[PDB]
Amino acid sequence: DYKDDDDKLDRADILYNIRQTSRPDVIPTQRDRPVAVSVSLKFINILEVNEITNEVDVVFWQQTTWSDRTLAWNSSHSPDQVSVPISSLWVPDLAAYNAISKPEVLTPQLARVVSDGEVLYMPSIRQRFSCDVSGVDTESGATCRIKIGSWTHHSREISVDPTTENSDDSEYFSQYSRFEILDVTQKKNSVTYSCCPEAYEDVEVSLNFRKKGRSEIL
Amino acid sequence: DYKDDDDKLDRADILYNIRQTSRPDVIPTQRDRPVAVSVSLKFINILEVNEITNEVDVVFWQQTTWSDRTLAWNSSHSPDQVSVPISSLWVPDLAAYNAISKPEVLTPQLARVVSDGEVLYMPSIRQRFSCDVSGVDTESGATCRIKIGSWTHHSREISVDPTTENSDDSEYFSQYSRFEILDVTQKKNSVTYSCCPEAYEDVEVSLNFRKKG
Amino acid sequence: DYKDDDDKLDRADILYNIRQTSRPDVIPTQRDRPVAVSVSLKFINILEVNEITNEVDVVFWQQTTWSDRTLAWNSSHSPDQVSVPISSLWVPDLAAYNAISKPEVLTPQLARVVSDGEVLYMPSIRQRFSCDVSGVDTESGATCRIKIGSWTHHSREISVDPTTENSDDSEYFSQYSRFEILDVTQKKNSVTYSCCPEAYEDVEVSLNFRKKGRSEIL
Amino acid sequence: DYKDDDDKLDRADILYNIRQTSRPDVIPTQRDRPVAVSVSLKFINILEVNEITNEVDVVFWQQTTWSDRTLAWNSSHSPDQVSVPISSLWVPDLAAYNAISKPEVLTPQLARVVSDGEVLYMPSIRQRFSCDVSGVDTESGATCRIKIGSWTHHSREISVDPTTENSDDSEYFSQYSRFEILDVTQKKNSVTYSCCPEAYEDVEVSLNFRKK
Amino acid sequence: DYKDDDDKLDRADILYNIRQTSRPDVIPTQRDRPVAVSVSLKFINILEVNEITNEVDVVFWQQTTWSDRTLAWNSSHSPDQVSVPISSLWVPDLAAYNAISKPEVLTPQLARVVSDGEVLYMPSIRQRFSCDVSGVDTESGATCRIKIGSWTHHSREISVDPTTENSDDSEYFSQYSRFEILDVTQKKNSVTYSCCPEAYEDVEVSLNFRKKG
């Protein structure tokens, strides 16, 4: 309930409840279905691009959501959401398969838990990637592909699905970047290896971008 | 009162009381209203300015204050204030929305708790930002804007307000910097996204500065 | 069996069982044989090659497995595998003898424990090495050798064995690298020092790689 | 007692006593008086100097001492001193007001606790500062001032005092540096802010140095 | 018993025994004598040298050993040696007097404990030092001296013994370095300061090296 959101004791009790029920290390599979993790990257900046080494340095908000209805509560007379340290929660073990640096989280490591069991987590992350930088200094731009999925959970355990297919991230991308975004495409993809049987679901993020205000030869 | 400030046992007891009462992970919403967080950035140094990439590296003291009346005590014959490790306290989950590096805290992670429940927290932070660097080597200078607000609490849970809206920062900015400030303003601002319902309050800090001639 | 894989209470109980049985600081010697650790490096990216200093900066997945039969459970009607924080497990104290930076782990620090007691651990690691970079700009390429073994356990306590002896890592190495891999060979080798006659087993990883576009103008 | 310093059980007992008595988060104020913190910086290395940006990169030993009498014990027949992890002790919340990087501690984080309750702590610290570098290539040299005081305790709670006003740090400063030290002065100084009522005591360390 | 080395339960019990007896924060002084620490550096690489600033960036293995007989056990029918996380053990608080960066430890932080109570600890460390780089491009080479000893324990509490062989230096030093080692000499010395009592033992490591060519 909206009116009761700022009831402190209620929030403290909800946090207590969440921590009693939460299993931070066990996947919240419900009904023998995989955990449906939804992921959508919102690019904030493109900081370094190297066309020779095919490397980019970027900042993005990793919009992440999933359900654990064992965390759910009756919010008819209590807050609808609270913030929770992610150390108290299970969080999907996502990794970018083509990252070449550690994900640097720039933000407080808190998630929102909603009374219906939905969890929202959105770290601001600075990270470097190996991807196709060719064409960045052209009209059509470069297309850098970033693949994100579970590091240890195959598709029967975790499914990683995109939220919105196409965007140009206009509400998020810095107007002061040297670069501009032409399109961001986010699609389901699946990876397997010859060594190892199971398939892994990932989201393949296609970042099409170019140098801004480039001087051309016409 | 200040005459009892160095009563060690009193300080120990106050710290004990604070740790018994404090809920570090719960917003201290009193009277069913948002937590009023007051913030002002005091710029100490401008370390690097890259007009190629529109990036700045700065050091600032983040003066931060709010109230949690449940922490209050009667200081008629006891210390007015004590220092407390911030891990013992709730602290607002502030973030700079246009930061491009982690906030590096340079100073002991302690806050002051006043006997009326007021909390004062002021880390010296070195951090990099993406902001408009155009004009830094002109008379009018550059204007670099930094937006600071709660990362996870919307306006009904936390309000973030500027302590003062206008400053020359003269008491704080390093006289030895190769840069000089023309103005620092701090304004209330609201942020919303099409994806999401609620609004998030922030403080928009506008740093107008130039390379000294 | 895999129909029971998403039974969450079962997963929680396996994790509990593993944590009750696991001795994280004790080598899991079975019978009185050394722990047999299988290791195979899959190179993902070659970030920097410094011909002046003979140094390389690389990213690789360190495919690692060993068994601890005391962790095994009956999985007739329970999950075959779970993910486990490596803090809950013994892991081999592997080190690269010619590393010149710390191994930076880019991925969630989780392992897979299989119901037969097998443990699989595969961190993505960025690390710098001192090695022979000569030849990198030639058809034959450079051969960079990295020796990896236990830091404190001799051959009677831990044996370290390569899996695949030869490969070009085509499933793993980035197509966007300015380098290309000719061959990755991984062989057993033994190290002793005049101070200390006890043999230490290691895998010698020979990375044969070359710069793309070796022929240029000037 | 000299003879008992290496009595290991005695050292373990003292450490146990210290940890039972110590309040690491409470200032050790005695007799309604501020904690007297004595501080002296000894510069070891001047690693980088930038005359354009007025920044220096230095290494120094922060010689720090104070007393907590509640830690004292009778050492007539036991060790006079032991080493203690600082996480078991209260240590002053000192910070350099013009630091522009994190203090990087290069040494084991241990203090010495003396049987009279004196505590000695001396980290080697690498840190960058914003200060006046002009004149560094001249004979008179540059004078870089570094202000060190409590970050959260005002003068009623903690006094920060120099041990020794003048020195050229000869036993400490690297002979192999490309800079040389002319003089290091360390003086009491007091800082007040228009926002806040009380004064904060600090040591102003004036580092007079030049390129060789 | 080496045939009993792989008895897992035996190893678990030894670790239990070590952890019950170990005092990680107390110097293991036996018979009212200083802890006799043996320590020597084995250089693996010289990565960067700057003759202008007199700085070197090197990698070495810190061969370290000492005794704590309270850890001893009877190994007639049990393992002779086990690996132990150093968090479970006292370790000498060694530091380099002329270090200008943190010691970056590149290896698992385990020590070996032997059934006679000997402890062996050998971190691979990358670290930068301020030292005499003059002569590096000459036949005579440079002589960079690195001074290492206890940070807080004087000579009556900890002694250091750096005596070791060096004709095996090519077993350790990288063949791929830009530099070559002429000699590594490691000798006892003592340090005192006018301000303070006691002497602190150190190991003066003289790294005599030159650029190849």
Ligand SMILES: COc1ccc(-c2cc(N(Cc3ccccn3)Cc3ccccn3)nc(N)n2)cc1
């Ligand atoms: C696919 O799943 C998601 C998850 C989160 C979001 C999301 C949340 C969101 N906020 C709540 C939130 C939840 C948790 C953490 C941080 N933040 C608000 C807000 C506003 C200003 C700065 C920061 N966060 N803002 C935006 N733009 N997106 C969207 C989709």
Ligand SMILES: COc1ccc(-c2cc(N(Cc3ccccn3)Cc3ccccn3)nc(N)n2)cc1
């Ligand atoms: C709007 O909220 C605030 C919060 C703090 C301040 C504040 C506090 C303050 N000190 C107390 C304090 C409380 C806590 C932590 C550190 N410091 C004193 C002082 C002086 C010299 C260095 C350090 N701190 N100094 C200054 N200039 N501003 C002002 C407004």
Ligand SMILES: COc1ccc(-c2cc(N(Cc3ccccn3)Cc3ccccn3)nc(N)n2)cc1
């Ligand atoms: C010689 O021993 C090994 C060990 C592991 C592997 C292994 C595991 C593996 N995955 C499972 C796993 C277990 C644990 C941790 C991470 N990953 C799958 C997978 C797929 C996409 C990204 C990540 N991991 N994938 C690949 N290619 N190899 C191979 C040989």
Ligand SMILES: COc1ccc(-c2cc(N(Cc3ccccn3)Cc3ccccn3)nc(N)n2)cc1
């Ligand atoms: C104003 O307060 C002080 C505090 C300490 C000192 C002090 C202590 C000191 N040592 C003891 C000590 C205590 C504790 C920690 C480290 N060290 C000896 C020694 C010698 C060689 C390296 C290291 N330490 N050496 C020097 N030069 N100064 C001086 C004044």
Ligand SMILES: COc1ccc(-c2cc(N(Cc3ccccn3)Cc3ccccn3)nc(N)n2)cc1
């Ligand atoms: C003066 O005291 C010492 C201590 C250790 C050594 C020592 C130990 C040693 N190993 C055992 C060990 C003990 C503990 C930790 C790691 N390692 C073997 C070995 C071999 C290959 C990589 C790693 N370690 N190797 C070498 N070269 N020296 C020598 C003298």
Ligand SMILES: *[C@@H]1O[C@H](CO)[C@@H](O)[C@H](O)[C@H]1NC(C)=O
């Ligand atoms: C939630 O609680 C309210 C009042 O406490 C009650 O009327 C309502 O039935 C509850 N909802 C459910 C689903 O039990």
Ligand SMILES: *[C@@H]1O[C@H](CO)[C@@H](O)[C@H](O)[C@H]1NC(C)=O
């Ligand atoms: C506060 O404390 C003093 C003495 O400690 C007492 O005189 C007074 O009544 C107390 N209550 C209030 C509300 O001040």
Ligand SMILES: *[C@@H]1O[C@H](CO)[C@@H](O)[C@H](O)[C@H]1NC(C)=O
């Ligand atoms: C495993 O448990 C199943 C399930 O009840 C049972 O049929 C059988 O006894 C077990 N199988 C073994 C021990 O091989």
Ligand SMILES: *[C@@H]1O[C@H](CO)[C@@H](O)[C@H](O)[C@H]1NC(C)=O
């Ligand atoms: C210290 O201990 C000795 C021996 O127990 C005792 O005789 C002496 O009186 C004590 N000193 C003080 C000052 O109490």
Ligand SMILES: *[C@@H]1O[C@H](CO)[C@@H](O)[C@H](O)[C@H]1NC(C)=O
């Ligand atoms: C050591 O232990 C073995 C059995 O554990 C025993 O036979 C022997 O007497 C013990 N003492 C010595 C000195 O070996």
